[PDB]
Amino acid sequence: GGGSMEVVGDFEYSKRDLVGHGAFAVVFRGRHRQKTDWEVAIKSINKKNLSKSQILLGKEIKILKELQHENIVALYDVQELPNSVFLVMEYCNGGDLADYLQAKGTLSEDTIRVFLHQIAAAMRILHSKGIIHRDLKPQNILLSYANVSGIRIKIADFGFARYLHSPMYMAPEVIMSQHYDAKADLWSIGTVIYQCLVGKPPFMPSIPRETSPYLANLLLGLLQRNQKDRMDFEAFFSHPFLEQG
Amino acid sequence: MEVVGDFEYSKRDLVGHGAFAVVFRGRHRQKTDWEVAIKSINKKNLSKSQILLGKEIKILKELQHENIVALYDVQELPNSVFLVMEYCNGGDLADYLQAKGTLSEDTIRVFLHQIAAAMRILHSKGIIHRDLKPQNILLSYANVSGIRIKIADFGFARYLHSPMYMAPEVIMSQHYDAKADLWSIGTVIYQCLVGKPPFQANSPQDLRMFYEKNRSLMPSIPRETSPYLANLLLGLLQRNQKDRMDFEAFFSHPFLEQG
Ligand SMILES: CCS(=O)(=O)Nc1ccc2c(c1)/C(=C(/Nc1ccc(CN3CCCCC3)cc1)c1ccccc1)C(=O)N2
Ligand SMILES: CCS(=O)(=O)Nc1ccc2c(c1)/C(=C(/Nc1ccc(CN3CCCCC3)cc1)c1ccccc1)C(=O)N2
């Protein structure tokens, strides 16, 4: 591919419009070839690189396909050239939360609530399909502007995601450790909210005196080293902090 | 006959089921003396399951050992995915145990040598099978010394991964099942010898809570058992992986390399 343009099923991109990189991956802004006002992200993935890695792209596609929520990054198409796999995906013109925090610094409780509402919305869908993300972080949380109220949040990167499995020969450590990471996402969402508020990840941790009681409750409930002790999903989904103003 | 890439099978020659899968004996369309197993998987069924077929294909592609079941081709029709694979004319160990009952120490050594051979390759690529059992361990006759063993079913297999936002339980549980296969190989050898698994419940949940409460102690090794084989089994059947025989100890255990 010497040339500037490239065709990927019903979509196309200029190599001029590179927006960022993932693992063995490069992401371009693109568009539908007929509906050209329809912007997409095209993730090019080097096959030889992938085949030498332990990345399960098949799994990521399986999970992306299964999730059709407005706060989970949409997969539109998969194309397989000889040298590359292409994923055609929702364009998120906002970059990731990491960029937004590097710009805005720390966020208001009003802002963090608007964002967390949408992250919670996505967490519902993962929990209800028995998917654990396990690599939630600001690099994985993408932003899409209409024009703070104009900002829509989309979860991405199911590289590390895994399905919960709801046997005499099976090792006891495997039998027992079933569901052991069931609550891993609730911690991560904790560290993320924390960083949004304080301006760095936390490592009970230092909750600033300014913090509202609800938000302090949520954070201390999420940031529990032992999952046994850590807030469960339904408690989080319906936590007072989310459904006020 | 139905066609799958360069291979073909009769629907007459169904040889069993797997998960959302049906298996036929087949052959190459030119090299017709080349028998294959053709595993048909319904896509709609798969898409509603939590089976990662891509992962299993990735792992099978990476493993080219004579004691790991060969994947030759993958074909994707609209309704079905087909896996063209080594034909194992012997069925699984489950069938062979239900027939033969218990096995001689000479027989169990011949089998375990070959399972060990495969375990080398998994360990050295950092793959854990995790669901080793007699239903997964296939047999292929040339004409007991004429029986070749192939590990199958990497459905449950996973790669060993050799970060502030990541949950502590995830960080710490890295490599926790690194020795899970050595237990499984234990239960299997045990069943081969005694004629039943070392530990049984009435359900998954009974056994969950059994292993959980640490009720599990060493199991009944018959007095007749040779010392080497008893050593191996007691070293493999250790509820705590910390205590459980390490791989190099297993690979080079006295039992395997005697005559
Ligand atoms: C990391 C998860 S991933 O699955 O591997 N990647 C992924 C998945 C889905 C995606 C994007 C990325 C994506 C991004 N847009 C995007 C990126 C940057 C910018 C900002 N300036 C950059 C250059 C100048 C113009 C735009 C705009 C849109 C983006 C790219 C890389 C990293 C993060 C976001 C988007 O619209 N949908
Ligand atoms: C292991 C789980 S799986 O991966 O989903 N199945 C799979 C994977 C690879 C395979 C086979 C099956 C297969 C089988 N051969 C086969 C099957 C049955 C018989 C029938 N005899 C049994 C012994 C003698 C009497 C008739 C012969 C060959 C077989 C089929 C279903 C279950 C198990 C084995 C084979 O040669 N290669």
Swiss-Prot record, chain A:
Belongs to the protein kinase superfamily. Ser/Thr protein kinase family. APG1/unc-51/ULK1 subfamily. Keywords: ATP-binding, Autophagy, Cytoplasmic vesicle, Kinase, Membrane, Neurogenesis, Nucleotide-binding, Phosphoprotein, Serine/threonine-protein kinase, Transferase. Serine/threonine-protein kinase involved in autophagy in response to starvation. Acts upstream of phosphatidylinositol 3-kinase PIK3C3 to regulate the formation of autophagophores, the precursors of autophagosomes. Part of regulatory feedback loops in autophagy: acts both as a downstream effector and a negative regulator of mammalian target of rapamycin complex 1 (mTORC1) via interaction with RPTOR. Activated via phosphorylation by AMPK, also acts as a negative regulator of AMPK through phosphorylation of the AMPK subunits PRKAA1, PRKAB2 and PRKAG1. ATP binds at V19, G20, H21, G22, A23, F24, A25, V26, V27, K43. This is Serine/threonine-protein kinase ULK2. Residues 13-242 form the Protein kinase domain. One of its GO terms (molecular function) is protein serine/threonine kinase activity. Its main location: membrane. The active site is at D135. The gene is ULK2. Interacts with SYNGAP1. Component of a complex consisting of ATG13/KIAA0652, ULK1 and RB1CC1/FIP200. Interacts (via C-terminus) with ATG13/KIAA0652. Associates with the mammalian target of rapamycin complex 1 (mTORC1) through an interaction with RPTOR. The keyword Nucleotide-binding applies. It is found in: Cytoplasmic vesicle membrane. Autophosphorylated. In response to nutrient limitation, probably phosphorylated and activated by AMPK, leading to activate autophagy. One of its GO terms (biological process) is axon guidance.
